[PDB]
């Protein structure tokens, strides 16, 4: 099945915009992939940067995830990053979301051989 990892970069990543481009970003980016398959995830973001800026997080600033665990990293530099919150206009499957654009530090949870990503956190 995917992996920890590849489910990160399904999730998070988009390396391939420097920021959302319009409203409609995270209804577009939600749907394709497939995060309102069997429900509407309410919360989610998308990093606009490269994967090799993303998977070096894992080795900056160590901080406890908002949970308690001790294998998160905040990284030292601020990102692009656009939230995508779901509306109360949502109703599955029509799922629909806010997109909001920012640059913030962001904050990961990392696992494994190589120690890449795996949980997105938080923004800071």
């Keep these: ?3 920890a990892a590849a489910k990160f970069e399904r999730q998070h990543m988009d390396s391939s915009t420097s920021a959302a481009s319009s409203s409609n970003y ?3 980016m939600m749907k394709s992939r ?3 398959k069997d429900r509407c995830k309410p919360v989610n973001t998308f990093v606009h940067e490269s ?3 993303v998977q070096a997080v894992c ?4 901080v406890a995830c908002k949970n308690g665990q001790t294998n998160c990293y905040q990284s030292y ?3 692009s990053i656009t939230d995508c919150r779901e509306t109360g206009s949502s109703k599955y499957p029509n799922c629909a ?3 909001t654009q920012a640059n913030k530090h962001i904050i990961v949870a990392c696992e494994g051989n190589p120690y890449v990503p795996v949980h997105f956190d938080a923004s800071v």
């Design 77 to 79: 530099s601020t990102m």
């Design 51 to 53: 994967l090799a800026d």
């Design 59 to 62: 080795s900056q600033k160590n």
């Design 26 to 28: 995270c209804n577009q």
């Design 34 to 36: 497939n995060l309102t």
């Design 97 to 99: 979301y806010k997109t």
């Design 1 to 3: 099945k995917e992996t």
